Amino acid sequence: PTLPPYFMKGSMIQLANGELKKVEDLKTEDFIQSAEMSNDLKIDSSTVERIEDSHSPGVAVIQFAVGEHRAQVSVEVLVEYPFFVFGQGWSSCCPERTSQLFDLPCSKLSVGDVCISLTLK
Amino acid sequence: RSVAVFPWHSLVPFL
């Protein structure tokens, strides 16, 4: 896949209620509150069950257990793609590269980390 | 005045 420009430090992110915040300052509650505020999107916990790094040049394959039922979902992303872990924030495969490329402090995504994902409601 | 802004729902995947 590819990488969008909104993970870049200083990127203005508009929360559900209209409030503006820099992407580096986003917290778990900002997402939780935004899902509540929204009339169509809700938050779904996605737990990382396995990370199969170096699938191909610059890509990792992550296997999640999405939502209540825990449906096995595997996805393919550029190593520097950051997920937002509940109570932890931006987390990727290569924190170092995500930080260098995005100037975003970042954790090491790990088996067991519950990520924030979305589904219609 | 106006500025380019990204919505919060772009930062999180639809797994």
Three-state SS string across chain A, please? CCCCHHHCCCCEEECCCCCEEEHHHCCHHHHHHHHHHCCCEEEEEEEEEEEEEEEECCEEEEEEEECCCCEEEEEEEECCCCEEECCCEEEECCHHHHHHHHCCCCEECCCCCEEEEEEEC
Instruction: Provide the domain limits for residue A98.
Output: 1-121
Q: Which phi and psi (to 5°) does residue A32 adopt?
A: -60, -45
A54 burial (CB, 10 Å; 0-12 / 13-18 / 19+) is exposed
Per the CB < 8 Å rule, is A20 touching B5?
A: yes
Count of CA atoms in the C-beta half-sphere (13 A) of A64: 23
CA distance A22 to A43: 21
| CA distances, A106 to each of A23, A80, A90, A120 (Å) | 12, 10, 5, 28
- Structural method: X-ray
Per the CB < 8 Å rule, is B8 touching A44?
A: no
Per the CB < 8 Å rule, is A118 touching B12?
A: yes
CA distance A9 to A16: 20
| Number of domains present in the structure of chain A | 1
User: Tokens at residue A104, please?
Assistant: 């975003």
Lateral strand order in the sheet of A20-22: A20-22, A12-14, B6-7
Q: Is the dihedral angle over the CA atoms A27, A32, A35, A37 positive or is it negative? A: negative
